[PDB]
Amino acid sequence: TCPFYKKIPGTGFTVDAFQYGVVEGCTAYFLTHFHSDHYAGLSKHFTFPVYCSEITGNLLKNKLHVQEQYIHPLPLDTECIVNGVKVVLLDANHCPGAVMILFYLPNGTVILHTGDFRADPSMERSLLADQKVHMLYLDTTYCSPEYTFPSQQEVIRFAINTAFEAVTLNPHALVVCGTYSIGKEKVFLAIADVLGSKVGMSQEKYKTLQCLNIPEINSLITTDMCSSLVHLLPMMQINFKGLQSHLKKCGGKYNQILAFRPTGWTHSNKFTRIADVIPQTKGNISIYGIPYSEHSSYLEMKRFVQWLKPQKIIPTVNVGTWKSRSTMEKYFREWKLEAGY
Numbered sequence: 001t002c003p004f005y006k007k008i009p010g011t012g013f014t015v016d017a018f019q020y021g022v023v024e025g026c027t028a029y030f031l032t033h034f035h036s037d038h039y040a041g042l043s044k045h046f047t048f049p050v051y052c053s054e055i056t057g058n059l060l061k062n063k064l065h066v067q068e069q070y071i072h073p074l075p076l077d078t079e080c081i082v083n084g085v086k087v088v089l090l091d092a093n094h095c096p097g098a099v100m101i102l103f104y105l106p107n108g109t110v111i112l113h114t115g116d117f118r119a120d121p122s123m124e125r126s127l128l129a130d131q132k133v134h135m136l137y138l139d140t141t142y143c144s145p146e147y148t149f150p151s152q153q154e155v156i157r158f159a160i161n162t163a164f165e166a167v168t169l170n171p172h173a174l175v176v177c178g179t180y181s182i183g184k185e186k187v188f189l190a191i192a193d194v195l196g197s198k199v200g201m202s203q204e205k206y207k208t209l210q211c212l213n214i215p216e217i218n219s220l221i222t223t224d225m226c227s228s229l230v231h232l233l234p235m236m237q238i239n240f241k242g243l244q245s246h247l248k249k250c251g252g253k254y255n256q257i258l259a260f261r262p263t264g265w266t267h268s269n270k271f272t273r274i275a276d277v278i279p280q281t282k283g284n285i286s287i288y289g290i291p292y293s294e295h296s297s298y299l300e301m302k303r304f305v306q307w308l309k310p311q312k313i314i315p316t317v318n319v320g321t322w323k324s325r326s327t328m329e330k331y332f333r334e335w336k337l338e339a340g341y
């Protein structure tokens with residue numbers, strides 16, 4: 001059964017609620033983004049209206065084979081009426097196609113649902129500017145002060161400089177990058193750009209990327225592995241065994257692998273600066289864990305919420321334990337007392 005924090009009161013709407021069968025009273029199902037925990041339950045047999053971004057709709061049609069008659073893409077930054085209620089989709093700064101949803105309820109209440117997001121000061125100059133928001137359904141993934149990590153720009157500078165140095169020292173080195181979902185494409189695109197290569201990948205991953213409206217994508221990616229010196233592999237293969245096995249398949253073209261595992265936050269962020277990050281190495285294979293996050297840091301989350309000044313916050317992540325709920329509630333109250341709302 002569908003939990004309370006996925007229902008929008010005063011409407012027939014749910015958000016990211018496809019794994020609960022027919023939700024009683026639901027006339028429109030919104031999907032914030034194409035990540036499996038959020039789309040869980042969708043398929044070609046789904047027969048209710050789904051509202052989403054254009055990019056999310058391309059993935060629904062081509063990857064999940066949802067019938068076109070049920071896919072309702074909406075443009076961003078545009079007031080739309082859905083089943084008698086005004087809504088707006090805003091860019092979430094998460095993965096491609098990810099949105100936040102503003103709902104203007106018939107009674108005058110305004111609700112913002114962030115979906116998954118990485119809060120940024122640029123959101124302060126979206127259509128949110130000077131918009132009173134009564135209720136905030138908040139991506140609380142990293143809602144504790146220990147969760148620190150660098151900017152995406154800093155992480156990409158590290159990855160580009162590391163890959164360029166390694167391949168310039170050894171032109172027979174291969175670069176490999178792990179993936180298990182959409183998101184974090186800048187990691188492999190930026191490395192391939194500095195090396196003068198297309199990114200090589202499976203047919204299935206190529207299909208996924210073809211759905212993402214990335215400018216000049218045909219110039220950047222390929223299924224011809226032999227033509228490419230930056231390869232994408234499943235995240236599960238980014239280990240010494242998996243990479244040794246891959247190197248064997250490359251027909252003596254390469255004698256070294258440099259691999260990247262984009263993660264979220266890890267406990268080494270409590271000790272080691274991005275500049276000082278070192279790999280794990282065995283023989284001619286080295287593996288870097290890089291903290292490329294598509295969720296708000298604690299500090300980014302706190303700034304956004306203190307700017308927005310919501311009357312009530314409903315967490316959508318870390319909801320399952322009393323300890324995590326109590327921790328989040330304590331921070332919301334600190335933030336409110338500090339800023340005066």
Ligand SMILES: CN1CCN(c2nc3ccccc3s2)CC1
Nearest residue numbers: 141142143144318321323324327
């Ligand atoms: C059994 N543990 C319960 C507490 N835990 C977390 N609490 C929060 C709160 C806010 C952000 C993240 C977390 S993780 C870890 C698991």
Ligand code: NI
Nearest residue numbers: 033035094116
């Ligand atoms: Ni997500």
